[PDB]
Amino acid sequence: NGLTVLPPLLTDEMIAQYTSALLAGTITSGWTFGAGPALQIPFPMQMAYRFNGIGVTQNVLYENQKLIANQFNSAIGKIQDSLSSTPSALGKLQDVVN
Amino acid sequence: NSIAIPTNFTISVTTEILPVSMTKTSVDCTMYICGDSTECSNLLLQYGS
Amino acid sequence: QSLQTYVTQQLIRAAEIRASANLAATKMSECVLGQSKRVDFCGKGYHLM
Amino acid sequence: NSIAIPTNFTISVTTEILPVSMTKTSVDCTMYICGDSTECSNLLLQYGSFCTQLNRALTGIAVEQDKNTQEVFAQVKQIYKTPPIKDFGGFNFSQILPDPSKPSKRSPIEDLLFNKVTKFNGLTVLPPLLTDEMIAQYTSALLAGTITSGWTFGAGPALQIPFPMQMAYRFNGIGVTQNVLYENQKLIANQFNSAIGKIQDSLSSTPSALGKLQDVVNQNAQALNTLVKQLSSNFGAISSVLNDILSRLDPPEAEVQIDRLITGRLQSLQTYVTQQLIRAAEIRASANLAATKMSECVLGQSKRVDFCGKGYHLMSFPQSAPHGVVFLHVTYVPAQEKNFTTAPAICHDGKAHFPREGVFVSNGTHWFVTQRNFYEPQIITTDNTFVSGNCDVVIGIVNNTVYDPLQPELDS
Amino acid sequence: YQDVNCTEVNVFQTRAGCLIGAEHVNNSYECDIPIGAGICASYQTSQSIIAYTMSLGAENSVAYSN
Ligand SMILES: *[C@@H]1O[C@H](CO)[C@@H](O)[C@H](O)[C@H]1NC(C)=O
Ligand SMILES: *[C@@H]1O[C@H](CO)[C@@H](O)[C@H](O)[C@H]1NC(C)=O
Ligand SMILES: *[C@@H]1O[C@H](CO)[C@@H](O)[C@H](O)[C@H]1NC(C)=O
Ligand SMILES: *[C@@H]1O[C@H](CO)[C@@H](O)[C@H](O)[C@H]1NC(C)=O
Ligand SMILES: *[C@@H]1O[C@H](CO)[C@@H](O)[C@H](O)[C@H]1NC(C)=O
Ligand SMILES: *[C@@H]1O[C@H](CO)[C@@H](O)[C@H](O)[C@H]1NC(C)=O
Ligand SMILES: *[C@@H]1O[C@H](CO)[C@@H](O)[C@H](O)[C@H]1NC(C)=O
Structure with a gap:
C-alpha cells in the first residue's frame, strides 16, 4: 500500500570486514592503532601492558x-555454549524488530 | 587493623548486546490515504502540505 | 490521523535508538580502542580487553 | 619478537563544533486561529482548554534554551584577564585571544565564524537572556584562565604557573617524559x-565545515514557513478567510464553515508544537554533551580516548559561534617509527629483570631500555629494572649483562 | 510590554520592550528575575523594584609571570 522498504547502504559483508579490521588491529597493534599509525607488538607484551594498567605488576603475567x-x-568456549543454548540471549535486538 | 588481600585471580568474558539501527521504511502519503482514485487527490489537495 | 500517530511514534523510537547508537x-x-578505568562501564571487574 | 617504537612526534589542532540551543519563539492561539474576529472566538471558546498548554509547552522550551546556554558557558566563577605583556615561551595565541583594537571584542576566528553563518500572525521571537558580548566575556575568561592557570581554576582558587611548565605537565600526563618538551x-x-593558522584558512575557505550549525537554522525556518502556509488553505471549506465567509453567508452555516477552519488550524498548531518538542529534546542532548x-576536556586533561580528538590529548580552547560552540582540540600524534627486537x-x-617503565629493545648488537612513546634509549642498570624470581618460567628471556652503578664506586 | 516602542501605552525602554514601574540603576549585581536581553530586575531598598544590567561575577586578574 505504498509501504516501501529501502535497503541499507552498508551490507553485512562490509560490516563484517570492518569488524575483522578492528579485531586484527587490536590483536597485532593494541590501542596504538586508534591514535595514529599502527605499531606492532607481541601479544604477551600487550597483555603485560593491560595487566600493568590496573595495578597488578607484569611478572605475574x-x-x-x-x-x-x-x-x-x-x-x-563457554561463551559459545551459553549464548548458543539459551533462547533469550538476543532479546535486546529482537524486541526492536518486533 | 585487619586487611584481606587476594592471592589468585580469574579471567571472565562477559557478553554485552546493543541495538544500533532500525529498519528504513518509507510511506507514500496519497497512495496510503487513498490511491488509484481521483476524488481522493482532488479533495486532499486542500487539506494542506 | 492514523498516519500522524504512526509517524510521531516512529520519531520517538528513532530518538531512543539514536541514544543507544551513541552509547x-x-x-x-x-573500550575496544583503549583500556578503560571507569568502573562497570566495560563489564563487572577490572577491564583488560 | 618485533617491536616498532616511534622516533618522532607531531602536534595537531582539530575543530569540533556542537550546536547549543535554538530560537525562543511563542505563538498566540487566538490571534493565529481567529485574529480580529468575534464569531470565530466564540466558536473557539467551546473547545475546552486546548490553547493554553500550547503556550505552556512553548514557555517550557524557551526557558529550557536559556538554561542550556547558561550551563554550557557559565562554568567559571570569576572573570580573569590575560596579562598585558604576552611572553608565553614562544607560543602565539594572537589568533584566539580577543583583540582590543577590534571594533567588537571578538577574536578573529570568532569573527570568521560569525560572518560564515547566515511572520506577523502572532508569531513572536523572544530575545535571549545572555547577549553575544556576554558570551564573549565568558569565553575570554575561560581562555585567560586556561592560559595562565591551567586546570586549577576549576578545582578551587586559580593558581598561576608558567606556560612551558604547564605543557611539561600535560606531556608528563600521557607517558612521555618532560625533557622532550x-x-x-x-x-x-x-x-x-x-x-x-591552517585552522583559520581551512575553515575560511571551505564553507561547509560548520554546516551542522546552519542546518539547525534552516529547518527551524521551514517549520515556521509551513505554519503560515496553512493560513491560505481552505481545509474543505468554502474559502480561506473569515471575512468572506461571514459576509457571503449566514450564521446557520457560517458556523459550520468556521468550525472546519478552526479544526484545520488547530491540527496544524498541534503538529508544529510536537515537532518542536522532539527537536528541543535532541538539542538538549547535544547541549549536555x-x-x-x-x-x-577544556578544564582538564582527559584520558577517554577519541573523546577529545584523534590522538593523545593536550589542551582545548573554546570559541562561540551563533547558537553553538566550537572547540579547537590540541592533540599529539606519533609520526616516524622504526623496527626493533624486544x-x-x-x-x-x-634472576630475571623486568623493566619498571619502558620496553627492552635492541638494534643489531646492543640491548637498551626505552620508554614506549619516543625512541630514547638508556643503558640497563639497576635503577630501571626490578628483579623477581629465577630465569626459568618466562618464555622468551634473553641473556645479557645488567650494569651496577655502585660497583665502580666501591672499587675506588 | 513586549516589542511596543512604548510611545503608545517610571518608564524604561529596552530591547525586549518597555517596562513601567522600575527605576534604571546604573549599578550591576547578580541576576534576580530575568527580564531579557541582558537586563534583569529585583526588589531592593524606601524599598522598590529596580531593573539593572546583569553581572558576570567579580572581576579578577592573576599575576602571571614566567
Ligand atoms: C589459582 O587458581 C587456579 C584456578 O584453577 C588454580 O589452578 C591455581 O592452582 C591457583 N593457584 C595459583 C598459585 O595460581
Ligand atoms: C621530527 O619531525 C620534524 C618535522 O615534523 C623534523 O623537522 C625534525 O627534524 C624531526 N626530528 C629529527 C631528529 O629528525
Ligand atoms: C603572533 O601571530 C600573528 C599572526 O596572526 C603575527 O602577526 C604576530 O606578529 C605574532 N606576534 C608575536 C609576538 O609573535
Ligand atoms: C646500534 O647501532 C648500530 C646499528 O646501526 C649497531 O651496529 C650497533 O651495534 C648498535 N649499538 C651502538 C652503540 O651503536
Ligand atoms: C617466535 O617464533 C619462533 C618460531 O615459532 C620461535 O622459534 C621463537 O622461539 C619465538 N620467539 C620467542 C622469544 O619465543
Ligand atoms: C644464558 O646463561 C646460561 C649460563 O651462562 C646458559 O646456560 C644459557 O645457555 C644462556 N642462554 C643464552 C641464549 O645464551
Ligand atoms: C522606535 O524604536 C527605535 C529603536 O530601534 C528608536 O530609535 C526610536 O526612537 C523609537 N521611536 C520612533 C518614533 O521611531
Missing part, C-alpha cells in the same frame, strides 16, 4: 602465561 |  | 602556531 591462556580459551 | 559508539571507541 | 620547545612552538566536553626479561645472575 610473564610467570602465569600458561594458566592465563587456558582460562582465556575455556572462557571463550 | 555503542562511545563503548567501541573508549 | 624542555628540549624541543622551539619545534613544538612552530608546529602549534602553524596549526592554528557540550557541557561535559567543556568540563572534562625481550621481556634479562637473566643476568639467574
Whole structure:
C-alpha cells in the first residue's frame, strides 16, 4: 500500500570486514592503532601492558602465561555454549524488530 | 587493623548486546490515504502540505 | 490521523535508538580502542580487553 | 619478537563544533486561529482548554534554551584577564585571544565564524537572556584562565604557573617524559602556531565545515514557513478567510464553515508544537554533551580516548559561534617509527629483570631500555629494572649483562 | 510590554520592550528575575523594584609571570 522498504547502504559483508579490521588491529597493534599509525607488538607484551594498567605488576603475567591462556580459551568456549543454548540471549535486538 | 588481600585471580568474558539501527521504511502519503482514485487527490489537495 | 500517530511514534523510537547508537559508539571507541578505568562501564571487574 | 617504537612526534589542532540551543519563539492561539474576529472566538471558546498548554509547552522550551546556554558557558566563577605583556615561551595565541583594537571584542576566528553563518500572525521571537558580548566575556575568561592557570581554576582558587611548565605537565600526563618538551620547545612552538593558522584558512575557505550549525537554522525556518502556509488553505471549506465567509453567508452555516477552519488550524498548531518538542529534546542532548566536553576536556586533561580528538590529548580552547560552540582540540600524534627486537626479561645472575617503565629493545648488537612513546634509549642498570624470581618460567628471556652503578664506586 | 516602542501605552525602554514601574540603576549585581536581553530586575531598598544590567561575577586578574 505504498509501504516501501529501502535497503541499507552498508551490507553485512562490509560490516563484517570492518569488524575483522578492528579485531586484527587490536590483536597485532593494541590501542596504538586508534591514535595514529599502527605499531606492532607481541601479544604477551600487550597483555603485560593491560595487566600493568590496573595495578597488578607484569611478572605475574610473564610467570602465569600458561594458566592465563587456558582460562582465556575455556572462557571463550563457554561463551559459545551459553549464548548458543539459551533462547533469550538476543532479546535486546529482537524486541526492536518486533 | 585487619586487611584481606587476594592471592589468585580469574579471567571472565562477559557478553554485552546493543541495538544500533532500525529498519528504513518509507510511506507514500496519497497512495496510503487513498490511491488509484481521483476524488481522493482532488479533495486532499486542500487539506494542506 | 492514523498516519500522524504512526509517524510521531516512529520519531520517538528513532530518538531512543539514536541514544543507544551513541552509547555503542562511545563503548567501541573508549573500550575496544583503549583500556578503560571507569568502573562497570566495560563489564563487572577490572577491564583488560 | 618485533617491536616498532616511534622516533618522532607531531602536534595537531582539530575543530569540533556542537550546536547549543535554538530560537525562543511563542505563538498566540487566538490571534493565529481567529485574529480580529468575534464569531470565530466564540466558536473557539467551546473547545475546552486546548490553547493554553500550547503556550505552556512553548514557555517550557524557551526557558529550557536559556538554561542550556547558561550551563554550557557559565562554568567559571570569576572573570580573569590575560596579562598585558604576552611572553608565553614562544607560543602565539594572537589568533584566539580577543583583540582590543577590534571594533567588537571578538577574536578573529570568532569573527570568521560569525560572518560564515547566515511572520506577523502572532508569531513572536523572544530575545535571549545572555547577549553575544556576554558570551564573549565568558569565553575570554575561560581562555585567560586556561592560559595562565591551567586546570586549577576549576578545582578551587586559580593558581598561576608558567606556560612551558604547564605543557611539561600535560606531556608528563600521557607517558612521555618532560625533557622532550624542555628540549624541543622551539619545534613544538612552530608546529602549534602553524596549526592554528591552517585552522583559520581551512575553515575560511571551505564553507561547509560548520554546516551542522546552519542546518539547525534552516529547518527551524521551514517549520515556521509551513505554519503560515496553512493560513491560505481552505481545509474543505468554502474559502480561506473569515471575512468572506461571514459576509457571503449566514450564521446557520457560517458556523459550520468556521468550525472546519478552526479544526484545520488547530491540527496544524498541534503538529508544529510536537515537532518542536522532539527537536528541543535532541538539542538538549547535544547541549549536555557540550557541557561535559567543556568540563572534562577544556578544564582538564582527559584520558577517554577519541573523546577529545584523534590522538593523545593536550589542551582545548573554546570559541562561540551563533547558537553553538566550537572547540579547537590540541592533540599529539606519533609520526616516524622504526623496527626493533624486544625481550621481556634479562637473566643476568639467574634472576630475571623486568623493566619498571619502558620496553627492552635492541638494534643489531646492543640491548637498551626505552620508554614506549619516543625512541630514547638508556643503558640497563639497576635503577630501571626490578628483579623477581629465577630465569626459568618466562618464555622468551634473553641473556645479557645488567650494569651496577655502585660497583665502580666501591672499587675506588 | 513586549516589542511596543512604548510611545503608545517610571518608564524604561529596552530591547525586549518597555517596562513601567522600575527605576534604571546604573549599578550591576547578580541576576534576580530575568527580564531579557541582558537586563534583569529585583526588589531592593524606601524599598522598590529596580531593573539593572546583569553581572558576570567579580572581576579578577592573576599575576602571571614566567
Ligand atoms: C589459582 O587458581 C587456579 C584456578 O584453577 C588454580 O589452578 C591455581 O592452582 C591457583 N593457584 C595459583 C598459585 O595460581
Ligand atoms: C621530527 O619531525 C620534524 C618535522 O615534523 C623534523 O623537522 C625534525 O627534524 C624531526 N626530528 C629529527 C631528529 O629528525
Ligand atoms: C603572533 O601571530 C600573528 C599572526 O596572526 C603575527 O602577526 C604576530 O606578529 C605574532 N606576534 C608575536 C609576538 O609573535
Ligand atoms: C646500534 O647501532 C648500530 C646499528 O646501526 C649497531 O651496529 C650497533 O651495534 C648498535 N649499538 C651502538 C652503540 O651503536
Ligand atoms: C617466535 O617464533 C619462533 C618460531 O615459532 C620461535 O622459534 C621463537 O622461539 C619465538 N620467539 C620467542 C622469544 O619465543
Ligand atoms: C644464558 O646463561 C646460561 C649460563 O651462562 C646458559 O646456560 C644459557 O645457555 C644462556 N642462554 C643464552 C641464549 O645464551
Ligand atoms: C522606535 O524604536 C527605535 C529603536 O530601534 C528608536 O530609535 C526610536 O526612537 C523609537 N521611536 C520612533 C518614533 O521611531
